[PDB]
Amino acid sequence: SVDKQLAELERNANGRLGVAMINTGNGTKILYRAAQRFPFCSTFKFMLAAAVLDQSQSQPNLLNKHINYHESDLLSYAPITRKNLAHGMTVSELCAATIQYSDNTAANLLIKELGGLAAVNQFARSIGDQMFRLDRWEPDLNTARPNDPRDTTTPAAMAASMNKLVLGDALRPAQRSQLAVWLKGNTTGDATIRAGAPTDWIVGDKTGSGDYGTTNDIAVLWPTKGAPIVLVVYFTQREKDAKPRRDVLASVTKIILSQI
Numbered sequence: 001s002v003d004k005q006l007a008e009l010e011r012n013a014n015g016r017l018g019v020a021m022i023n024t025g026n027g028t029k030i031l032y033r034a035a036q037r038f039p040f041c042s043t044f045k046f047m048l049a050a051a052v053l054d055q056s057q058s059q060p061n062l063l064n065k066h067i068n069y070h071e072s073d074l075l076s077y078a079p080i081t082r083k084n085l086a087h088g089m090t091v092s093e094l095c096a097a098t099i100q101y102s103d104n105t106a107a108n109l110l111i112k113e114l115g116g117l118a119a120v121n122q123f124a125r126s127i128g129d130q131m132f133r134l135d136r137w138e139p140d141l142n143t144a145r146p147n148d149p150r151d152t153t154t155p156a157a158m159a160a161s162m163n164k165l166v167l168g169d170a171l172r173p174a175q176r177s178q179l180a181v182w183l184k185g186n187t188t189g190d191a192t193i194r195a196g197a198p199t200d201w202i203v204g205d206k207t208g209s210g211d212y213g214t215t216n217d218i219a220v221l222w223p224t225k226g227a228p229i230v231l232v233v234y235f236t237q238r239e240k241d242a243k244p245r246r247d248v249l250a251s252v253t254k255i256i257l258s259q260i
């Protein structure tokens with residue numbers, strides 16, 4: 001029933017759908033195609049910020065490091081780093097921007113500070129995530145080509161990680177809080193998981209879009225009654241210039257929340 005509705009939603013939507021849900025209330029999970037790979041797109045920015053937060057556990061001054069980025073770093077999609085070209089940004093603001101606005105330059109800048117793509121992989125491995133895999137820099141990583149494993153995860157791996165990172169004990173508390181906070185101030189989420197959620201709830205989220213109408217969102221939801229819930233929804237379609245299907249994410253959320 002739980003399964004049948006998603007399968008039916010996915011049939012109807014003409015794409016492939018990946019859900020994982022974790023109610024940290026009891027400890028129960030709703031999984032649909034949870035072990036299949038999907039192109040994460042901008043959703044990895046979450047993992048990237050966690051990595052930065054992990055590294056700042058050693059480096060008291062990391063978050064406050066002033067970064068003076070150049071003209072040549074700027075990309076098509078970078079409202080915030082564009083706005084502050086001239087004054088530079090702190091690593092910490094870089095994190096807010098990457099999360100809350102999905103700024104690509106900020107991300108590239110942060111990967112470089114961590115010391116490259118493989119440092120995001122290694123952070124992913126050290127938290128038990130064995131599926132996360134970053135292969136290219138922005139903007140090349142949102143091609144979402146059919147059965148291309150580059151730059152993918154599984155819904156389950158991303159839920160487990162978001163769970164450990166935001167609600168578990170992956171991080172120390174100040175770093176943990178910072179992560180939730182960035183998430184809470186996200187500005188790209190109104191139309192996806194937020195839209196399928198009681199308007200009284202509080203949602204922190206990271207979205208993703210890309211080719212093949214890849215539409216993704218990864219969220220913590222703070223309910224009125226009870227414990228936080230982890231929700232990961234990934235979706236992809238037939239054609240390369242497919243338009244996003246945010247509605248599908250809204251409807252998935254609506255389904256999952258009835259069950260609870």
Ligand SMILES: *[B@@]1([O])O[C]C2=[C]C(F)=[C][C]=C21
Nearest residue numbers: 041042077102142208209
């Ligand atoms: B991403 O997946 O989040 C939004 C976005 C914009 C863009 F231009 C490239 C990649 C992403």
Ligand SMILES: [Cl-]
Nearest residue numbers: 173174176177
């Ligand atoms: Cl805390």
